[PDB]
Design a protein around this motif. Sequence first.
Motif, PDB file in Angstrom:
ATOM      1  N   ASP A  71       0.812  -1.226   0.000  1.00 57.21           N
ATOM      2  CA  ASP A  71       0.000   0.000   0.000  1.00 57.21           C
ATOM      3  C   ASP A  71       0.840   1.269   0.000  1.00 57.21           C
ATOM      4  O   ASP A  71       0.305   2.393  -0.060  1.00 57.21           O
ATOM      5  N   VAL A  72       2.155   1.090   0.071  1.00 59.32           N
ATOM      6  CA  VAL A  72       3.086   2.221   0.153  1.00 59.32           C
ATOM      7  C   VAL A  72       3.497   2.750  -1.221  1.00 59.32           C
ATOM      8  O   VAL A  72       4.094   2.035  -2.045  1.00 59.32           O
ATOM      9  N   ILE A  73       3.199   4.022  -1.464  1.00 57.70           N
ATOM     10  CA  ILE A  73       3.692   4.687  -2.677  1.00 57.70           C
ATOM     11  C   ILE A  73       4.943   5.526  -2.337  1.00 57.70           C
ATOM     12  O   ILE A  73       4.956   6.228  -1.328  1.00 57.70           O
ATOM     13  N   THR A  74       6.010   5.364  -3.118  1.00 60.70           N
ATOM     14  CA  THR A  74       7.199   6.222  -3.009  1.00 60.70           C
ATOM     15  C   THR A  74       7.309   7.110  -4.255  1.00 60.70           C
ATOM     16  O   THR A  74       7.218   6.629  -5.385  1.00 60.70           O
ATOM     17  N   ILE A  75       7.446   8.414  -4.026  1.00 58.95           N
ATOM     18  CA  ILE A  75       7.785   9.332  -5.084  1.00 58.95           C
ATOM     19  C   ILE A  75       9.107  10.012  -4.747  1.00 58.95           C
ATOM     20  O   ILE A  75       9.214  10.694  -3.733  1.00 58.95           O
ATOM     21  N   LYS A  76      10.122   9.801  -5.586  1.00 55.62           N
ATOM     22  CA  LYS A  76      11.388  10.526  -5.451  1.00 55.62           C
ATOM     23  C   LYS A  76      11.445  11.553  -6.556  1.00 55.62           C
ATOM     24  O   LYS A  76      10.944  11.313  -7.660  1.00 55.62           O
ATOM     25  N   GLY A 122      -4.685   8.551   1.489  1.00 59.82           N
ATOM     26  CA  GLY A 122      -5.593   8.999   2.555  1.00 59.82           C
ATOM     27  C   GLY A 122      -4.958   9.283   3.916  1.00 59.82           C
ATOM     28  O   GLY A 122      -5.587   9.916   4.759  1.00 59.82           O
ATOM     29  N   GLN A 123      -3.731   8.810   4.146  1.00 66.86           N
ATOM     30  CA  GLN A 123      -3.033   8.972   5.428  1.00 66.86           C
ATOM     31  C   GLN A 123      -2.166  10.224   5.384  1.00 66.86           C
ATOM     32  O   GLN A 123      -1.278  10.314   4.530  1.00 66.86           O
ATOM     33  N   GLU A 124      -2.405  11.164   6.303  1.00 68.25           N
ATOM     34  CA  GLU A 124      -1.589  12.399   6.422  1.00 68.25           C
ATOM     35  C   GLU A 124      -0.164  12.116   6.851  1.00 68.25           C
ATOM     36  O   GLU A 124       0.060  11.246   7.679  1.00 68.25           O
ATOM     37  N   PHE A 125       0.789  12.852   6.281  1.00 70.81           N
ATOM     38  CA  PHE A 125       2.205  12.708   6.664  1.00 70.81           C
ATOM     39  C   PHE A 125       2.965  14.047   6.762  1.00 70.81           C
ATOM     40  O   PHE A 125       2.540  15.058   6.220  1.00 70.81           O
ATOM     41  N   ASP A 126       4.103  14.035   7.458  1.00 66.50           N
ATOM     42  CA  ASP A 126       4.982  15.200   7.528  1.00 66.50           C
ATOM     43  C   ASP A 126       5.921  15.184   6.340  1.00 66.50           C
ATOM     44  O   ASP A 126       6.536  14.142   6.031  1.00 66.50           O
ATOM     45  N   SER A 179       0.845  16.884   4.718  1.00 67.88           N
ATOM     46  CA  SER A 179       0.495  16.427   3.374  1.00 67.88           C
ATOM     47  C   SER A 179      -0.446  15.213   3.384  1.00 67.88           C
ATOM     48  O   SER A 179      -0.252  14.281   4.157  1.00 67.88           O
ATOM     49  N   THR A 180      -1.445  15.223   2.504  1.00 66.29           N
ATOM     50  CA  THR A 180      -2.276  14.056   2.262  1.00 66.29           C
ATOM     51  C   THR A 180      -2.374  13.856   0.761  1.00 66.29           C
ATOM     52  O   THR A 180      -2.676  14.808   0.016  1.00 66.29           O
ATOM     53  N   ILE A 181      -2.093  12.630   0.324  1.00 63.64           N
ATOM     54  CA  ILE A 181      -2.273  12.239  -1.075  1.00 63.64           C
ATOM     55  C   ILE A 181      -3.390  11.215  -1.171  1.00 63.64           C
ATOM     56  O   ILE A 181      -3.453  10.259  -0.407  1.00 63.64           O
ATOM     57  N   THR A 182      -4.276  11.437  -2.121  1.00 67.97           N
ATOM     58  CA  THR A 182      -5.390  10.557  -2.364  1.00 67.97           C
ATOM     59  C   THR A 182      -5.498  10.325  -3.864  1.00 67.97           C
ATOM     60  O   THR A 182      -4.841  10.984  -4.679  1.00 67.97           O
ATOM     61  N   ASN A 226      17.814  16.142  -4.000  1.00 67.25           N
ATOM     62  CA  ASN A 226      17.015  14.925  -4.064  1.00 67.25           C
ATOM     63  C   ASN A 226      16.053  14.844  -2.892  1.00 67.25           C
ATOM     64  O   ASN A 226      16.482  14.850  -1.737  1.00 67.25           O
ATOM     65  N   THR A 227      14.759  14.810  -3.198  1.00 66.07           N
ATOM     66  CA  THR A 227      13.719  14.593  -2.194  1.00 66.07           C
ATOM     67  C   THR A 227      13.017  13.245  -2.446  1.00 66.07           C
ATOM     68  O   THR A 227      13.186  12.622  -3.511  1.00 66.07           O
ATOM     69  N   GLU A 228      12.239  12.801  -1.456  1.00 65.97           N
ATOM     70  CA  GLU A 228      11.565  11.514  -1.497  1.00 65.97           C
ATOM     71  C   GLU A 228      10.473  11.454  -0.429  1.00 65.97           C
ATOM     72  O   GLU A 228      10.683  11.823   0.732  1.00 65.97           O
ATOM     73  N   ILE A 229       9.294  11.021  -0.841  1.00 67.45           N
ATOM     74  CA  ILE A 229       8.196  10.811   0.080  1.00 67.45           C
ATOM     75  C   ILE A 229       7.622   9.413  -0.146  1.00 67.45           C
ATOM     76  O   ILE A 229       7.511   8.965  -1.293  1.00 67.45           O
ATOM     77  N   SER A 230       7.317   8.728   0.961  1.00 67.42           N
ATOM     78  CA  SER A 230       6.560   7.470   0.974  1.00 67.42           C
ATOM     79  C   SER A 230       5.274   7.672   1.794  1.00 67.42           C
ATOM     80  O   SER A 230       5.307   8.253   2.894  1.00 67.42           O
ATOM     81  N   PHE A 231       4.148   7.190   1.269  1.00 64.77           N
ATOM     82  CA  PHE A 231       2.873   7.436   1.916  1.00 64.77           C
ATOM     83  C   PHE A 231       1.897   6.350   1.531  1.00 64.77           C
ATOM     84  O   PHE A 231       2.113   5.618   0.561  1.00 64.77           O
ATOM     85  N   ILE A 232       0.808   6.301   2.286  1.00 64.58           N
ATOM     86  CA  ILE A 232      -0.346   5.478   2.014  1.00 64.58           C
ATOM     87  C   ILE A 232      -1.455   6.473   1.624  1.00 64.58           C
ATOM     88  O   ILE A 232      -1.565   7.570   2.208  1.00 64.58           O
TER      89      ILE A 232
END
Length: 134
Positions: free
Chosen positions: A50-55, A70-74, A85-88, A62-68
């Motif tokens: 369920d984990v999406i990574t965007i680098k 609907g789940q808010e993250f820093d 941040s929330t990605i849906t 170089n930045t990188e975020i991993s998220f699920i």
Amino acid sequence: SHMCDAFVGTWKLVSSENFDDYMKEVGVGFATRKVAGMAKPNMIISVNGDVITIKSESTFKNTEISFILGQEFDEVTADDRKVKSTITLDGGVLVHVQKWDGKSTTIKRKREDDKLVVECVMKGVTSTRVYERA
Ligand SMILES: Cc1sc(NC(=O)C2=C(C(=O)O)CCC2)c(-c2nc(C3CC3)no2)c1C
């Protein structure tokens, strides 16, 4: 087959419109805008469970975020905002909301033909950054 299969992969920036003004709306300072404006970042999207990574990779940072979904993250942004941040997934479109100091911006990623199109909005101001497979 899954959620974000048509997003997965390595992508490179081919065009950008109205980016400087979007950055001004966001509060980005002069030197950072000029540096940002030169960059042709690669964007690497991967999925694991369920984990999406965007680098995002470029000459600058170089930045990188991993998220699920609907789940808010820093998230620390490329200009150094600390945001919430929330990605849906809005039927095909990845909708990324960043909230900070009472403000809010929205970044939409969608597949159009062979392009990954990134639409960045804050208040009135829209920037369109177009990527193609690396
Ligand atoms: C080398 C780079 S690249 C880049 N930004 C991007 O590439 C962006 C997108 C993309 O195409 O992925 C979509 C949103 C911005 C910044 C940068 N952005 C900002 C604020 C606007 C956030 N400040 O610096 C810098 C220093």
